[PDB]
Amino acid sequence: GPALCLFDVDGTLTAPRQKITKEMDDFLQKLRQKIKIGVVGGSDFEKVQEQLGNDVVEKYDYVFPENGLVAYKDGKLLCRQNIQSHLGEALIQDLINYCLSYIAKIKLPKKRGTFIEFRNGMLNVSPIGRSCSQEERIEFYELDKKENIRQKFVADLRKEFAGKGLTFSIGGQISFDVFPDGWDKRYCLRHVENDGYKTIYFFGDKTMPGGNDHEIFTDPRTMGYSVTAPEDMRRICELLFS
Amino acid sequence: GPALCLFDVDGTLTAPRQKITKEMDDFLQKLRQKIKIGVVGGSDFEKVQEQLGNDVVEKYDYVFPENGLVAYKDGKLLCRQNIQSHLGEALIQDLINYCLSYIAKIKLPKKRGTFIEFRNGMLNVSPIGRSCSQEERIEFYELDKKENIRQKFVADLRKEFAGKGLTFSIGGQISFDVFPDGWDKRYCLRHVENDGYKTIYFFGDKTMPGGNDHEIFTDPRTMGYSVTAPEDMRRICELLFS
Ligand SMILES: [Cl-]
Ligand SMILES: [Mg+2]
Ligand SMILES: [Mg+2]
Ligand SMILES: [Mg+2]
Ligand SMILES: [Mg+2]
Ligand code: NA
Ligand code: NA
Numbered sequence: 413g414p415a416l417c418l419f420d421v422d423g424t425l426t427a428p429r430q431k432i433t434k435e436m437d438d439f440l441q442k443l444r445q446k447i448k449i450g451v452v453g454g455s456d457f458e459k460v461q462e463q464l465g466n467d468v469v470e471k472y473d474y475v476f477p478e479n480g481l482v483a484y485k486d487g488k489l490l491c492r493q494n495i496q497s498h499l500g501e502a503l504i505q506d507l508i509n510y511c512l513s514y515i516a517k518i519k520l521p522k523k524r525g526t527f528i529e530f531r532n533g534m535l536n537v538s539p540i541g542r543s544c545s546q547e548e549r550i551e552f553y554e555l556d557k558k559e560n561i562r563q564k565f566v567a568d569l570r571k572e573f574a575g576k577g578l579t580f581s582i583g584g585q586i587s588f589d590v591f592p593d594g595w596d597k598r599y600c601l602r603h604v605e606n607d608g609y610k611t612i613y614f615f616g617d618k619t620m621p622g623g624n625d626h627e628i629f630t631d632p633r634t635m636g637y638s639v640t641a642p643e644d645m646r647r648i649c650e651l652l653f654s
Numbered sequence: 655g656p657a658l659c660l661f662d663v664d665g666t667l668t669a670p671r672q673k674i675t676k677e678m679d680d681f682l683q684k685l686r687q688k689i690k691i692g693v694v695g696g697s698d699f700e701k702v703q704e705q706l707g708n709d710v711v712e713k714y715d716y717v718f719p720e721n722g723l724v725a726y727k728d729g730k731l732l733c734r735q736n737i738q739s740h741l742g743e744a745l746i747q748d749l750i751n752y753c754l755s756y757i758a759k760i761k762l763p764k765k766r767g768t769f770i771e772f773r774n775g776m777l778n779v780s781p782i783g784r785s786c787s788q789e790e791r792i793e794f795y796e797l798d799k800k801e802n803i804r805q806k807f808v809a810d811l812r813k814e815f816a817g818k819g820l821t822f823s824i825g826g827q828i829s830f831d832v833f834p835d836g837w838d839k840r841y842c843l844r845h846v847e848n849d850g851y852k853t854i855y856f857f858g859d860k861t862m863p864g865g866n867d868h869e870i871f872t873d874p875r876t877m878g879y880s881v882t883a884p885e886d887m888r889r890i891c892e893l894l895f896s
Binding site for chain 2: 496501504505508509510512513515516517520521522523524525526527528529530535541543
């Protein structure tokens with residue numbers, strides 16, 4: 413029946429870390445004459461504008477920056493959400509206060525700054541502080557592998573807060589993320605499942621476990637297609653939609 | 655007697671929070687034909703370039719952003735220091751740990767992120783967090799006047815860290831600075847002292863006790879002059895050097 417194509421941005425519509433080409437932009441505008449199209453990415457609206465152009469909301473039926481916490485439909489804001497509004501200020505502060513006190517008790521070779529980075533979709537917590545140098549990240553990650561600093565911190569947090577519907581995810585060298593359950597790319601699906609689409613295709617290049625596309629790829633509401641590069645995506649769309 | 659004029663920037667060479675005028679810019683360049691000139695300010699190099707021009711290091715013999723923690727002479731960057739190398743990692747962490755535990759206990763309407771910002775010459779500490787929105791900044795600021803949050807925080811820190819060689823200074827709306835004794839504007843004098851100048855003039859608009867020019871003004875190494883406005887600075891310079 414009616415259908416929607418949903419695309420990851422970076423690595424799917426664009427070369428990794430790169431802006432969309434005029435030829436790809438032209439392709440999608442011709443594809444949009446056949447099927448509705450939308451884009452979803454983890455970055456804020458400003459970066460999405462850098463990757464796809466400042467007129468992004470006019471070129472796609474849906475634009476979902478920040479995994480859909482910001483949502484545009486047919487050119488106007490459909491909806492906006494953030495962690496403080498959803499969790500409430502009290503719980504935000506309990507979580508922040510617990511982390512600050514915990515980090516004050518961690519014995520480390522070095523502590524710097526930005527221990528708590530507040531983002532609309534998550535809190536990124538770092539015992540050493542995100543401001544540390546690359547050399548200092550490596551020192552910390554080596555201590556962390558031997559002492560399980562982040563593992564233990566996250567375990568204690570799961571015991572204290574997870575009944576409030578919070579997921580904790582370790583990643584990289586120095587930090588972990590705290591965010592409400594399901595606030596990955598799947599969040600955007602709430603904004604399209606009511607609009608009467610019989611099939612919602614999803615194209616992404618990080619569909620395997622740990623990738624930022626895995627949960628939306630696996631969700632039963634999407635017909636997921638893994639792609640290796642934008643050219644692989646365009647070859648699949650030629651076979652699917654002529 | 656070869657001499658040097660050191661100028662505070664904001665309120666002294668420029669109107670408060672504004673770029674220098676082309677008229678004042680031409681005046682200082684004519685003054686440079688008779689005497690070496692230099693600028694000092696607490697802001698970073700980018701802000702100094704915004705106020706005085708991207709070619710500032712070419713237009714002024716000395717440029718001392720961040721009170722001189724970053725220092726240019728004749729267009730080239732000088733020998734550098736930072737707070738963790740001067741204070742030691744142990745004192746840095748005791749300061750950071752104490753501040754983190756204290757912030758955890760403060761009752762605020764809202765808390766966000768970047769509670770501690772690690773800078774070259776200071777630790778900047780915000781009870782609400784530097785990443786807060788403008789509305790949240792004003793909200794906290796009005797609360798701080800009523801409840802004296804920053805003032806009590808700083809009073810407690812002066813007791814806990816007595817004799818460790820630290821200085822604490824509340825500024826702006828949301829934060830206070832912790833820096834080593836003497837790393838106010840006086841810091842830059844290390845780069846001009848005993849370097850051939852019989853007189854080091856200094857001009858500043860906040861030379862009163864509590865002002866960010868007080869210590870450099872009262873330092874014996876400088877012939878200090880208090881100015882009431884950029885036009886008053888020009889009056890004194892025309893008196894002294896014409
Ligand atoms: Cl922080
Ligand atoms: Mg991707
Ligand atoms: Mg699926
Ligand atoms: Mg001033
Ligand atoms: Mg003096
Ligand atoms: Na729904
Ligand atoms: Na800056």
